[PDB]
Design an enzyme around this catalytic site. Sequence first.
Site, PDB file in Angstrom:
ATOM      1  N   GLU A 212       0.882  -1.182   0.000  1.00 31.76           N
ATOM      2  CA  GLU A 212       0.000   0.000   0.000  1.00 31.76           C
ATOM      3  C   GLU A 212       0.918   1.230   0.000  1.00 31.76           C
ATOM      4  O   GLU A 212       1.074   1.928   1.009  1.00 31.76           O
ATOM      5  CB  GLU A 212      -0.925   0.025   1.227  1.00 31.76           C
TER       6      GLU A 212
ATOM      7  N   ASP B 214     -12.703   0.200   3.975  1.00 31.75           N
ATOM      8  CA  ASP B 214     -11.456   0.412   4.722  1.00 31.75           C
ATOM      9  C   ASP B 214     -11.643   1.257   5.990  1.00 31.75           C
ATOM     10  O   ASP B 214     -11.593   0.714   7.096  1.00 31.75           O
ATOM     11  CB  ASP B 214     -10.372   0.991   3.795  1.00 31.75           C
TER      12      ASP B 214
ATOM     13  N   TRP C  73      -7.425   7.466   8.395  1.00 30.70           N
ATOM     14  CA  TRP C  73      -7.201   7.338   6.965  1.00 30.70           C
ATOM     15  C   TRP C  73      -8.408   7.713   6.100  1.00 30.70           C
ATOM     16  O   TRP C  73      -8.302   7.653   4.871  1.00 30.70           O
ATOM     17  CB  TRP C  73      -6.775   5.903   6.650  1.00 30.70           C
TER      18      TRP C  73
END
Lengths: 423, 423
Positions: A214, A310, A316
Site C-alpha cells: 500500500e 477500509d 485514513w
Amino acid sequence: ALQTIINARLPGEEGLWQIHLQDGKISAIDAQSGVMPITENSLDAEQGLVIPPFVEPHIHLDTTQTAGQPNWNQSGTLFEGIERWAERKALLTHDDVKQRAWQTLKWQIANGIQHVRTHVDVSDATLTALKAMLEVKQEVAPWIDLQIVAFPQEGILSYPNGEALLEEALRLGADVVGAIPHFEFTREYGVESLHKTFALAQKYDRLIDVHCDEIDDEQSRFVETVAALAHHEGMGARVTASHTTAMHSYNGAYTSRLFRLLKMSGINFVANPLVNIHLQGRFDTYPKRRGITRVKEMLESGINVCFGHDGVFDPWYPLGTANMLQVLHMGLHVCQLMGYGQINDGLNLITHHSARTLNLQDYGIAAGNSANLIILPAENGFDALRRQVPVRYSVRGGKVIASTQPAQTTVYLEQPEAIDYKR
Amino acid sequence: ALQTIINARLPGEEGLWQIHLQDGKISAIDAQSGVMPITENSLDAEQGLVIPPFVEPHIHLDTTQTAGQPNWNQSGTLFEGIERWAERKALLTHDDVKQRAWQTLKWQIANGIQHVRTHVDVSDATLTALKAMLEVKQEVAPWIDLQIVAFPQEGILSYPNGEALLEEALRLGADVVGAIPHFEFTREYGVESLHKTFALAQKYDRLIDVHCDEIDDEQSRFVETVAALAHHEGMGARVTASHTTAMHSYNGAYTSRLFRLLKMSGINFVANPLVNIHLQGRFDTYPKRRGITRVKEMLESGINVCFGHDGVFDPWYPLGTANMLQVLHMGLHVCQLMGYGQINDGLNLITHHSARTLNLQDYGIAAGNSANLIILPAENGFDALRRQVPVRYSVRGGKVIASTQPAQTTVYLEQPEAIDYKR
Ligand SMILES: O=C1NC=C(F)[C@H](O)N1
Ligand SMILES: O=C1NC=C(F)[C@H](O)N1
Ligand SMILES: [Fe+3]
Ligand SMILES: [Fe+3]
C-alpha cells in the site's frame, strides 16, 4: 414466519423468480411467468433485485469514528495516518472500542451487510482493541458474521515483540493473520515477515489477509511472495492481498509476468477505492496518479478482486456511512469500469467476489443455503448503482433484520409530480 | 597564557559574551552588557562570532593531492575515479602518503578545523596508506584529532581477502569500520557486507561510516539496512551513512516510509556538496539532476546531517583549499537552503552536526569542555557565509594554534576608501 420471496429479479437472469423458504433456509427457487400476488408470509420484492448480502471485506472497526482524535491527519497520507492512530491507540479503552465498533456495525446492518472482515491493530502489548472486538463478534453474531484479522500495524519484525503479539492474537481467537511488509524497516524484513505469517496461518489453520504494497513505490513487490507462498502451500483460497496499490505504478512487462502467478495461486485481492483515491498520489505534484490496483485487468484475467470501505471516519478516511454501493460507485469511476455491462456487473465486486475473499461456505441464493438475502428497489445492478438505492429489506435466517422506507420526492409544477429518477 | 575570550557573539544568542579559561578548559561563560576593554591575556573577538571548531567529517587524506597521477579522471564519475585511484594506489609509498596528508592537514589547521575523519583505502594487501596515516594521526594530535576509517574501496566481498584486510585494519587501530555496498558485485553481497561491517564494529567497539548508495540508481537502498542494523544493535549514535546520493532519485512514497526508520535509528548522514554536484548526474543528458541527498528534509525531520569536503585535489575532485565555509556555500545553493534563517543556521552543518557524526565527547562552548574554539570576523552565520571569511584565530587547549590577518582592500576614488563588503 416468511415462507416466500416473490417477484424477484436476479442478476444475470431473465424474468421474475420466487424463492421458497423453510426452516431458515432456501428450499427452492422457481421462475415465474408473470407477477405474483402478495399474501401473508410472502415478502414482495416488487420486481426489485434480490441478491445475497453485501459484504465488507476490509474495514478497521477499532479505529472507526476516531478521526481528529487527538489530532487530524493533515497530509492525508498512510504514514501520517499511522502516526495519528498511534496517538489514539494509547488512549484506547475496552468500552470505547466496543461502542464505536457497534455504531458502525449498526450502519452496516442498515446497509444490508451481513459479513464483515475487520482488521484490528495488534501492535499493542495490552491488546485492548482485540479483546473488545472478540466480545463484539459474539454480540453481533445474530446479524453479522464478523471475521477478525490480527493486524500488526507497526510491523512484525519492526515492532517490539511483534511476532509474539501476532501469535498471541491468534491464540485468543483472531480468524485471520495479517501483515504489512512495505512498512517493515527493510525489504528483507518484509519478505521474512511473510514467511512468518504463512507459518502461523498453517500452524493455527487460519486465513491470511496482508496489507500488501500500500505505497506508490514501483519497487514494492511483496505481492509476488504472498502469491508464491500461497501456491507452494496449496492454500490460495485462504489468502488475500489487500490494497496492492503499488501495482498501479508497475511497468507492464513485470505486471504481465506477475499475473500468471496471481492466477495460478488463486489468491484474492481487495481494492479500497474511497481510501486509495485519497491516500495514494500524495507524493506526486501534477499529473497525479489514481493509485488503485489493477482491478480491470484482474477481472479480465479471471483473478478474484473485490472492494472494501477500509475506514469510516478514522485516521485514513474522514467520511463514510459504510455504504457498499458508494464504495462501488467510486471504484467504477476511478478504475474506468464505465461500460454498461461493467457497471451492471459491478455488484459482484461487493457481493460474490467478497464472499470468496472471506472464504464463505454459506453464501448465495441457492437451494440448501441459509435464507440470507437482501432486496434492492432497482431493476438491475446498473440501476441500483446509478440511483444509489437503499436496502429495502435485509433478511437473515429467513427473518427481516432491517428495512428502509425509501424517500419520497415531489416537485410542484403546474401539478404535483412524484420524482423517482428512473427512465 | 590566555585567560579570557571577550566581546564574543554566539550563534542563536543575543548580545556579547565573555568566555573564561582555566587550565586549558572553559571555566565559565558570562553575558556582557556592552563592549569590554582589551588587556593582556584577553583575546578580543571584536564582536565577531565564536564557535567550537570546524569539523571535516569526510575526507580522503590518502588520495589528497594526487589528481592527474598518473592519469586524469576524464569522465568525472565515481567509477572512473576508482579506476584512476587504483593506478595511483599501486605507486604508493609511506613517505608519499605522509607528506600529502600533512599538506592538506596544515590547510585544515589554518581553516580552523580541529576534528577530521579520513577514510583510508584498505583494499590493499600492503596497507601502505593505513600504516602511514596511523603515524600521521599521532603526529598531528596536538592540533587535530584525526579519526581513521578502514575503507574497503573495492568492496568487502568483491575484492580478494577484502574482509580479512578490513579486520586487519581494525586490529592495527582504525577507529571506524567502512563499507561500500553499491560497489559490490551484487545486491546480496551489498547487504551481506553490511552485516559483516556491523559484526566487526561490535567485536572491536568501533564506529561505522559507510560510503552508502553513492550512485544515481533509484534501486540502491542500502541505507535502509544500515539504519535497521543500527536500530537492532541500539548503536545509532555510532553509525554514519555517507553520501546517500541515490536518495535524490527515490520516489517520495518510499522516502517517506524510510524517513521513519532513519529518525528512529538515530544514525548520522554526511553530504559532500562539492564532490556530489561534480560526480552525480553524469549519466543524465538534460535535464540533469543535482544528486545531493535530502538534506533539507532531514533538517526538517530532525535527522542529523552534515557536510564534508570529501576530496582535495584527488581522483574525485580537482579543486579545494579544505575550506568548510566553501563546502557549506555549495551545499546551501544546491540544496536550496537559501532562506535567511536556513543560511544563518548553516554553520551547524559544519560544526555541531559534524561533531555528533564523529561521536565527539568534548565539543562545544560550554563550561567544563576543553578550550577549543575559533573566532570568525563576522556578525553571524549568514555574514560569515556570505563574505567567506577566514578564521581570525583558532584556539586549542586555550592556546592560539592559527591566525589570519585579513586582506585589506582599497579603492581609489576621489579619495581612498577601504572596502570590507559589509552593509
Ligand atoms: O495500514 C493501514 N492501516 C489502516 C488503513 F485504513 C489503511 O488500510 N492501511
Ligand atoms: O567511493 C569513493 N571514494 C572516494 C571518494 F572521494 C568518493 O567519496 N567515493
Ligand atoms: Fe486497511
Ligand atoms: Fe568519500
